[PDB]
């Protein structure tokens, strides 16, 4: 009875107008997005009319701030529900994120993942249309500590911020490797500098057990063979799952959007904690999990007949076209004269010989279009997107439906990245495809 | 011809009124402070009328926020020039620090160490009186990364914050210890998770040389014997020194106030970088260096006939009396019922069996009173201060001149802590003292 379509996409790093060019392949992407009931993207940029102050985000690759007019580019392109939790929503601080919420609400754009407090960032947003409703929840595993939103206390307000999915990494080391680490701790004098903390706290904060260790701000555990494990923060995982169970009661479809740069054993595999997280979301009743962060595609998994897109890469990539570069960002490039933004990005990438420009994986994208009937996935179309690899810097990063030859190559990539999950793909003559479903 | 007196003090963590009690020893401390030309303290609390949002400062021991009326307690007690750079000025974020500047300027209180941008935080403040002028510069080596102020760029504003003194720690390890660290890096799979960063940056960010290593967010260097070294950030050191040379041209006296929790080889010794910093300040023309942070006293050094007070501890200590505890602070204490602030601090310290309450070193203080004649130090009086060790929580932390017996014990402590620097002390019958000077 109820039939709904959802378009998914990755990072929307838009800094300029004319997002949809006069290219027919770009206009057909807008037609595709505007033909769906809901079209989701990750707003990977701070739209601003001037509120807030730049934070030091060198780890994130600099500040990502744009004129608020780019929001009209996003909506006119067809995107209608925004995920906002990512490592850039806080690029203008708490005042910036409050400014973003003001800008989105005044334009009537449904959004999730940020809020004036932690609950508001965790909440789903409900997008209602004549055919039905979609609940979007948005969280991020990549952010600067402290940027997560905070709930109020009886005496103090909350803190505006993002919806966090924290996680811990543990280094598994052999018993002899652990002994050397403790020896380094004692012999360098590092242990001596915790003598004060021992008296105040009553014990050494580095001793978590005789086979567990916290040194150099890292977790070490004795194991038979060296290894590396990651685990979700239990409180974030339980709380996000809690809100998914809430959203499932109040919407036809529940989509969880999660930002995650963290790599697994290989750059193309997701962190193990992310896979546990995605499984939990569907266990709690989500109909899809859309991931992003790495700026390249990752595999697709079908779990209990619901799709997990571990990374849809970038749908818009205009980092190097930003006109708002902070002083701390400029300082990362030695210069014998004050730099303009474009020259700064040219020197930052070594005139295009490093960073994202040389590699083609950073300029292919994918827009899945999912069809649900009463919550059952009945189709998952795959539309490869081309972002213009090798074009001049002012042209690349704008999305268009890839031509047949490039779409087939992208579809092969997705199939190969999805093969470890048992995912199969049917391929159309035009280079588009769709997931093979059990339903 | 020009004769000026300066009172120095450590952390002023004031959260309640009645700072100066009706105790004659407390009234005599106010008389002492109000009898000097300048009386400096470190404002270790955010005075607030409600502007800003609490930041997660668990490392700093929680948020330190108080009614703005405490500023009238500070000035009525006799303090007249405030240092504001410390690990708590940013407890209410950028909006909070702008609110503090508003509150201080409206009350006519000279302050340094915070600003709307980096230059404003680095600037000296000039306090002018009929007998002469003092320049106060204020910086902190202890703060959460990102809390430092930022200067504007051609396109973006600055960021309000504190005046930073950053520093790096390097672990010296033997060549065989270094080999084990690299082996752990490779065998755990940690090196494999940097494969992406290798292609984007062009090289491994962990390889700083074949005898240098960045692992686990820590610096390692091959050395013949294990060790531990710290070094000032060259840019912060050159810039603060730059402003000291500026201040020396425009004031009779230049005082540098530096917040530093970082311990040396032992808890009572300052970090080596702090000692290099203090020497540089006097090399550049400062007349005194006043340190604070650890909440206990550290030694006193005479360098080129100018005093360095590596830590004057606390002059006011009312952390446990704060009425503004954030939600993230409350979460550090497991509770089967919502907690009031006082009960929260009782459970946080294990009902007084840990943290600062049991140890007497955290409740002794020192107020030096320095006399300069044409920039030459001619006297350095030492006035021990008692903060009420063992008194009920609502009474301890308010300062008074220690009685003779306790003042003598504190003076012995200062002499012993200052002995490694060759400092000698003359002792008066009342338990006060003064440094032995070469002039």
């Amino acid at each position: 009875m109820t039939r709904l379509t959802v378009a998914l996409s990755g990072d929307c790093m838009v800094t300029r107008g004319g997002l949809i060019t006069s290219d027919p392949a770009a206009e057909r992407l807008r037609d595709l997005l505007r033909g769906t009931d809901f079209a989701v993207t990750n707003l990977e940029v701070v739209p601003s009319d001037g509120r807030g102050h730049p934070v030091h985000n060198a780890v994130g690759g600099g500040c990502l701030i744009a004129d608020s007019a780019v929001l009209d580019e996003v909506t006119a392109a067809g995107f209608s529900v925004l995920g906002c939790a990512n490592n850039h929503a806080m690029d203008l601080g708490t005042e910036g994120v409050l400014g973003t919420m003001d800008l989105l609400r005044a334009r009537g754009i449904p959004y999730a993942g940020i809020g004036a407090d932690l609950t508001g960032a965790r909440r789903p947003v409900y997008a209602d249309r004549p055919g039905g409703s979609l609940a979007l929840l948005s969280c991020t595993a990549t952010f600067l500590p402290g940027q997560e939103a905070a709930d109020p206390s009886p005496e103090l307000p909350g803190r505006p911020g993002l919806n966090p999915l924290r996680h811990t990494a543990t280094m598994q080391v052999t018993a002899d490797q652990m002994d050397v680490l403790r020896t380094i701790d004692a012999e360098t004098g590092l242990r001596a500098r915790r003598a004060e903390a021992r008296a105040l706290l009553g014990v050494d904060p580095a001793l978590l057990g005789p086979d567990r260790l916290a040194l150099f701000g890292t977790r070490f555990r004795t194991a038979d063979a060296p290894g590396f494990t990651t685990e979700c923060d239990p409180r974030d995982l339980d709380e996000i799952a809690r809100w998914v169970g809430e959203a499932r009661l109040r919407a036809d479809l529940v989509v969880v959007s999660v930002h995650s740069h963290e790599p697994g054993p290989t750059p193309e595999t997701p962190g193990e904690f992310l896979r546990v997280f995605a499984h939990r979301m569907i266990d709690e009743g989500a109909h899809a999990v859309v991931g992003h962060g790495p700026h390249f595609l990752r595999g697709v998994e079908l779990y209990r007949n619901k799709p997990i897109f571990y990374s849809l890469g970038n749908i818009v990539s205009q980092i190097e076209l930003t006109d708002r570069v902070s002083a701390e960002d400029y300082a990362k490039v030695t210069a014998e004269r004050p730099l303009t933004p474009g020259r700064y990005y040219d020197r930052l990438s070594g005139h295009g010989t490093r960073l994202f420009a040389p590699h083609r994986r950073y300029w292919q994208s994918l827009v899945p279009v999912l069809t649900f009937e009463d919550g059952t996935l009945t189709a998952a179309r795959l539309h490869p997107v081309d972002l213009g690899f090798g074009r001049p810097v002012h042209r690349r990063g704008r999305p268009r439906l890839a031509d047949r030859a490039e779409a087939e190559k992208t579809l092969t990539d997705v199939a190969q990245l999805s093969q470890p999950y048992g995912t199969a793909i049917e391929v159309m003559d035009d280079g588009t495809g769709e997931l093979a479903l059990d339903v | 011809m020009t004769r000026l007196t300066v009172a120095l003090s450590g952390d002023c963590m004031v959260t309640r009124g009645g700072l100066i009690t009706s105790d004659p020893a407390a009234e005599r401390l106010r008389d002492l402070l109000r009898g000097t030309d300048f009386a400096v303290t470190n404002l270790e609390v955010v005075p607030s009328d409600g502007r800003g949002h609490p930041v997660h400062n668990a490392v700093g021991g929680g948020c330190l926020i108080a009614d703005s009326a405490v500023l009238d307690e500070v000035t009525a007690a006799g303090f007249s020039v405030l240092g504001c750079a410390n690990n708590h000025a940013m407890d209410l974020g950028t909006e909070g620090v702008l609110g503090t500047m508003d509150l201080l300027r409206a009350r006519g209180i000279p302050y340094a160490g915070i600003g709307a941008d980096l230059t404003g935080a680095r600037r000296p403040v000039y306090a002018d009186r009929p007998g002469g002028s003092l320049a106060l510069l204020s910086c902190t080596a202890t703060f959460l990364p990102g809390q430092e102020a930022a200067d504007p760029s051609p396109e973006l504003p600055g960021r309000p914050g504190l005046n930073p003194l950053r520093h790096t720690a390097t672990m010296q390890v033997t060549a065989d210890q270094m080999d084990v660290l690299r082996t752990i890096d490779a065998e755990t799979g940690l090196r494999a998770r940097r494969a992406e960063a290798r292609a984007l940056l062009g090289v491994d960010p962990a390889l700083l040389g074949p005898d240098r290593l960045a692992l686990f967010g820590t610096r390692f260097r091959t050395a013949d014997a294990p060790g531990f070294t710290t070094e000032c950030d060259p840019r912060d050191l050159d810039e603060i020194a730059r402003w000291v040379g500026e201040a020396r041209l425009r004031a009779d006296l230049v005082v540098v106030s530096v917040h530093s929790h970082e311990p040396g080889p032992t808890p009572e010794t300052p970090g080596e970088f702090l000692r290099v910093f203090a020497h540089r300040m006097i090399d550049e023309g400062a007349h005194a260096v006043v340190g604070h942070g650890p909440h206990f006293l550290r030694g006193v050094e005479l360098y080129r006939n100018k005093p360095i007070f590596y830590s004057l501890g606390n002059i006011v200590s009312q952390i446990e009396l704060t009425d503004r505890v954030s939600a993230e602070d409350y979460a550090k204490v497991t509770a089967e019922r919502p907690l009031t602030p006082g009960r929260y601090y009782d459970r946080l310290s294990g009902h007084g069996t840990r943290l600062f309450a049991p140890h007497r070193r955290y409740w002794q203080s020192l107020v030096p009173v320095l006399t300069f004649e044409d920039g030459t130090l001619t006297a350095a009086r030492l006035h021990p201060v008692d903060l009420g060790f063992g008194r009920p929580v609502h009474r301890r932390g308010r300062p008074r001149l220690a009685d003779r017996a306790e003042a003598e014990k504190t003076l012995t402590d200062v002499a012993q802590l200052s002995q490694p620097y060759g400092t000698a002390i003359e002792v008066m019958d009342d338990g006060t003292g003064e440094l032995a000077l070469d002039v």
Binding site: V59, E262, H295, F356 | -
Partner: peptide, 7 residues
Amino acid sequence: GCGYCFG
């Protein structure tokens, strides 16, 4: 704060 993340 990223441990073992551009743009």
